[PDB]
Amino acid sequence: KETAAAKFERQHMDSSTSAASSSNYCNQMMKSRNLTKDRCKPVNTLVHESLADVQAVCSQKNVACKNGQTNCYQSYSTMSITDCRETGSSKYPNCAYKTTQANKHIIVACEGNPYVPVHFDASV
């Protein structure tokens, strides 16, 4: 079984680029990060900053999570991110995603020792 921290890395980390290259970035990334294996993950955000920078958020602004839990943190600075969301023409096994690049604050849920990101809650 994949650890929560490892799952967060696979789903939400892409430090290899400064920002979404093209409109096909999401189709490519959602497939390579295995998020279209048995079904198309409807929504997924990828962060284009170093793993260290994202992990550091767990020691930044403590804020409420959408679900009410209090283990969420909002990055002090904005970060390059890409939101990947299924389009209307998307239908397994032919997943299709819209790529939306943005520079905003990220909010992640943290847990464990080390205290690292285990969920991507939202971006602001």
UniProtKB/Swiss-Prot annotation:
Location in or out of the cell: Secreted
Active site per database record: 12, 119
Tissue specificity annotation: Pancreas.
GO molecular function, one term: ribonuclease A activity
Primary residence: secreted
Broad class of enzyme this protein falls into: lyase
Tagged with keyword Ribosomal protein: no
Residues that, per the record, bind substrate: 7, 10, 41-45, 66, 85
Gene Ontology terms describing biological process: defense response to Gram-positive bacterium
Sorted UniProt keywords: Disulfide bond, Endonuclease, Glycation, Glycoprotein, Hydrolase, Lyase, Nuclease, Secreted, Signal
Catalytic activity: an [RNA] containing cytidine + H2O = an [RNA]-3'-cytidine-3'-phosphate + a 5'-hydroxy-ribonucleotide-3'-[RNA]; an [RNA] containing uridine + H2O = an [RNA]-3'-uridine-3'-phosphate + a 5'-hydroxy-ribonucleotide-3'-[RNA]
Top-rank lineage group of the source organism: Eukaryota
EC numbers, comma separated: 4.6.1.18
Glycosylation sites: 1, 7, 34, 37, 41
GO CC terms: extracellular region
Annotated S-S bridges: 26-84, 40-95, 58-110, 65-72
Biological function: Endonuclease that catalyzes the cleavage of RNA on the 3' side of pyrimidine nucleotides. Acts on single-stranded and double-stranded RNA.
Record's subunit section: Interacts with and forms tight 1:1 complexes with RNH1. Dimerization of two such complexes may occur. Interaction with RNH1 inhibits this protein. Monomer.
Family statement drawn from the similarity comment of this UniProt entry: Belongs to the pancreatic ribonuclease family.
Protein name listed in UniProt: Ribonuclease pancreatic
Upper taxonomic lineage: Eukaryota, Metazoa, Chordata, Craniata, Vertebrata
Shown part of the complete sequence: 27 to 150 of 150
